Structure formats: structure tokens, C-alpha cells
């Protein structure tokens, strides 16, 4: 989990825009992810995770460039919302007393607020003759007609 | 018995899968009058 220690005074990309969090997790969020700019570079310096004796006066090639370490060592290195929900979702309703507007809800009648809001959300997401009947009653009864 | 979460801790750590769910008139005889359906 790479991050910066609090009190750090260097530059961090998008440090001046993120709000409401400490320097620690703001820097921890910003290090890993590039977004608009480039990610922290590939070569990251910051945040780490002999056949001769001494006194020899002969010439050893490319030994004047190596420094800060002893003669034998330099010789060694010289050699080397419900609207968005689905219609089949049971949560597509509004609880009783919701002031907020629901489309196609004013036209429905005779239903409770949750059922009416569910219907509104779904809609927003989307004889022959008296003589014939009473005549020939002798052959075909009134039940037969 | 024990909860499902306790059964999870007992198989990843101790390597045992123990899941025992241990638990804790006739009618009177016919007399001889009337019918057997009426007297019943």
C-alpha cells in the first residue's frame, strides 16, 4: 500500500482538488491511478519497497570512474432511484408521504401510494331481441336462449 | 448447533468439516336397529 507520510511537502497530482479526506488516503488513492495524467513513472527513485593486492601501482582499466568504495572492490567492478431499477424489481415503489414528483401518477385513481407509485414508475419506464329471446320459449326455454 | 460463520472458521483454520445438525376414536359397535348409516 504505497502512500506518502503526513506532513510531506512535495507535489502530488490532483492533490489540490480531492476533498474531505486526510493527506494519507488522498495520496494513497492518487499514487496508483493515472486518470487524466500519466501514472508515476517506470523508474521510481522515491518510495523504495582480483589477482593483485592493495598498494599496487599498475594500471587497471575504467577504475577512475568508480568511487566511494575500496581499492579491491573498485578493481572487482573494473574487471566485472426506483426509476433506474427494473420493472421486475420489488423495490420499485415510493413510501407513504413522498413529496417528490412521480410522472404519470396524477391520472391514476383508487389505489394506495406504494401501488400507485409502482404503477406510475412502470408507466414512465414503458338480450339481442326481446321478441327473439321471449319467443319460441316452448321449444327452447329461457335458459336455452 | 452453530451458525454458518462459525462453520467457516472451523474449516479454514482447523481444517475440519463438521456439520452435524443434531436435533432435540373408533365408532361404537352396531346394536341392531335401523340402518348402519342412520345409527352412525
Amino acid at each position: 500500500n504505497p502512500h506518502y507520510i503526513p506532513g510531506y511537502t512535495g507535489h502530488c497530482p490532483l492533490l489540490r482538488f480531492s476533498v474531505g479526506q486526510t493527506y494519507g488516503q488522498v495520496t494513497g488513492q492518487l499514487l496508483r491511478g493515472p486518470p487524466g495524467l500519466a501514472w508515476p513513472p517506470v523508474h521510481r527513485t522515491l518510495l523504495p519497497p582480483s589477482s593483485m593486492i592493495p598498494g599496487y601501482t599498475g594500471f587497471v582499466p575504467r577504475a577512475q570512474f568508480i568511487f566511494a568504495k575500496n581499492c579491491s572492490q573498485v578493481w572487482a567492478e573494473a574487471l566485472s432511484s426506483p426509476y433506474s431499477m427494473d420493472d421486475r424489481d420489488p423495490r420499485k415503489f415510493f413510501m407513504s408521504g413522498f413529496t417528490g414528483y412521480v410522472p404519470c401518477a396524477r391520472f391514476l385513481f383508487g389505489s394506495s401510494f406504494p401501488v400507485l407509485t409502482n404503477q406510475a414508475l412502470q408507466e414512465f419506464g414503458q338480450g339481442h331481441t326481446f321478441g327473439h329471446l321471449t319467443h319460441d320459449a316452448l321449444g327452447l326455454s329461457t335458459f336455452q336462449k | 448447533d452453530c451458525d454458518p460463520f462459525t462453520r467457516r472458521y472451523y474449516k479454514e483454520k482447523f481444517g475440519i468439516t463438521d456439520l452435524p445438525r443434531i436435533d432435540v376414536q373408533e365408532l361404537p359397535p352396531y346394536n341392531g336397529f335401523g340402518l348402519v348409516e342412520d345409527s352412525a
Binding site: 476533498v19 413529496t99 414528483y101 410522472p103 396524477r106 | -
Partner: protein, 427 residues
Amino acid sequence: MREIVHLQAGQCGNQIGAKFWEVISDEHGIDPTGTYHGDSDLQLERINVYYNEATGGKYVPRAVLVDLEPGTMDSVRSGPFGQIFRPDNFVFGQSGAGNNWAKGHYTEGAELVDSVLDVVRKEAESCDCLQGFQLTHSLGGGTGSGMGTLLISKIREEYPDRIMNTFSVVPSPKVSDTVVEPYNATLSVHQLVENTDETYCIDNEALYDICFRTLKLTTPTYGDLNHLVSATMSGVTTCLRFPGQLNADLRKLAVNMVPFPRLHFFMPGFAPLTSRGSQQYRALTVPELTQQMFDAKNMMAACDPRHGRYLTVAAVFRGRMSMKEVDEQMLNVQNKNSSYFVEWIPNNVKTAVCDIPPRGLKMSATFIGNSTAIQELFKRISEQFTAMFRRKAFLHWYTGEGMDEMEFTEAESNMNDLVSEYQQYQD
């Protein structure tokens, strides 16, 4: 939930309002036909404020369109978003105003207001609970100055306990385009100071300087000029339609900003303005926005606030931001400009923060200013009145239709009463 009735009369008031309904229809994702097409659901919970549902999932606005000419009514129907309005709301006469105040308030405007107010009370009676009125007009014309004071007088006599949002375009000294502007200006402030809870003043020459310094527009036509007023128009009432974090509705601005019954004329503003070139070079932060507010060149009136003092400032922020940086930066600007803000009122500045910024920008802010420097706007109109009233010029066109000379002296006395209050409190 809170219901706002919108009215518009006059040529300058019709075209800005037609540019107003274009911005907010895209804000809530309404098609030009009247069909909802948006991305987020938060734009739909408060849609009853401006729009009314029609049968079939179609939306209509709450606007009343009135003029004495049929010329500009054909232009509003012919606009890009003109098909949304109600054909029953198109009431108009046939005789032109002639840039005459008496031809809109006494002679020919007295026959039309019977059917004008009947359409207004039809819309307000359908509302469950009304909040206030928003009217667009110009102070220099014959319609918007005449009929503007006529309608607000008749509405307030029948809705006493409401709030009035009169969005008036004031006359300009250099961009004066009528010779009788001092006559039409002084004749409307007699009813504006008495019967308006708050008035927002707009000139034409400061909007050109904004278009030439901050925006660097080469050809700032009327199509882009009215859009500058349209952003502050829709930015003042964002807390009634969108969820927020420190909410402040229209009557809350009435309590914080009106200390005396006749000091309520506000200077407006907008806060994220930039030119086209430097979009990639500007750092969009609250300390950058707050410097853009109190710049002398960023308000929309022809008055220098350095020539006066400040009574009360309110600015409505929008977007995702913290509140310490809002509260400190609007305390740093008060302490550094200690001389400008008055000493007899502590904490001159009122802040408000919403949660939904407008489309195409990460954050935005609307600036509103009440200052003593607005006495300069009323001083020049008053002294332009005296040089024309001395020789009685352009007077028979007024006195030939009912008005008298005794009305002119009373209206100029009211400006002298109004302008004296700002100078009295300054020292």
C-alpha cells in the same frame, strides 16, 4: 414542491425569458417537443416548480406571454425551444405601445389586463402551494415599463403574502436607444420601490464590457448577451429544484438581505466565466471562484462598488466542494475589504451550497450584491429627467392621453426619497 409563476412582457423581457426556458429545459433534460430525455434521476423529483405535466408524458411550462404587438409573439413561437409553450397563454392586443408609458398603463393596457390576469390566476389556482412571481421587463420601454408596474400592482392586491422577483433591465447612459428613457424610467420606480420584494438590475454597457474583457467575444450579439443574464436567472433558485448541503430558498434571501423596506435593489452576477482560449489554463477551485466574484468588472450593473459601501452579500455555490474553504474565503474577503462593508452590520455575507452543478462544468456559483453604489444608477436618470422636464419636451404624447404634469413631480420626488437613503447610511 414550491410553485413559481413566470410572466414576461415587452420586447426585452420576452427574448431573455425565451432564452431562459431554453437553458433550464436542457438542465432537466426536456426535449424541445416536451418529452423528458435525461441521464440522472435527480432532475425529475422537483419538476413541478417550472413545468406542468400534460397527458402522454409531455411537459409544458408555467409562462404567461403578453404584448401589445403581435410581432414578437411570432418570434417566440419561432425560437429553438418555442414549441413547448401553451397556446392558451398567448394573449395579446393589436395596437403598438409606441414607446409610451401611458399607452401601456392607462389607455390601451387597461383593456387587456382583464384577460391577462385571468390566465395567471388559472395557473396559480391549479398549484397546491404558491411561492412567488418572476417577471421579466425593461425599464425604458412603453410595454415593459408601463405594463410591468401594472401587473405587479394588480397581483399584489390579490396575493398579499408572496414574494416578487422583478428582473428589470435598467437604462444605460451610453447605450441609450430611445430619447424618452428618463420618462419611462422614473414612471416605473414609483411602483417598483413600493411593490417589489427584490429587484435585480441589469444594464447593457456592463454586459458588453464583460463580453469584451472576461469573455473576449469578437461579435457579442443579442443571442449571447441575453444568455449571460439567463445563467444568473436560473442560478438564484437552484435550492428549490435540486438537493443540496446548505439549502436557502427565495424567502430566505428575503430575510437575510432586506434590512429596510425600500433597500432591496440587487446587483447580480455569475462566477465561473472564462474565455475560450484559457479553459485549459484556468485552475477551477473555490479560491479562484471567490476572486472572480468580487472583481470590479464581473457584476452586471453600471456602478463601481468602490464608490460606495456594501449592505448585504449572498452567493449561491453549486457543485461538490467542502465548507471550510467556502467559509474562510468569504471571511477573508470581508476582513480585507473592511472599509467597503459596513461596520454597523456584522457578518454581511451569506453563503449557500447545492449538490448538482450545471452541465458542462464541474462547479458554478451565482453572485448577488446589495450595495450603496446603486445610487449612481438612479442619480443619472434623475438628472436626465430634470434637463428634459425643464423645457417640457416630449410631454404632449403623455399628457394627450390622460396623464398630467402633477404626476411627473411626484415620481421624481420618489427617486429623491429613494436615493437619499443610501447616502444617509453611508456615513
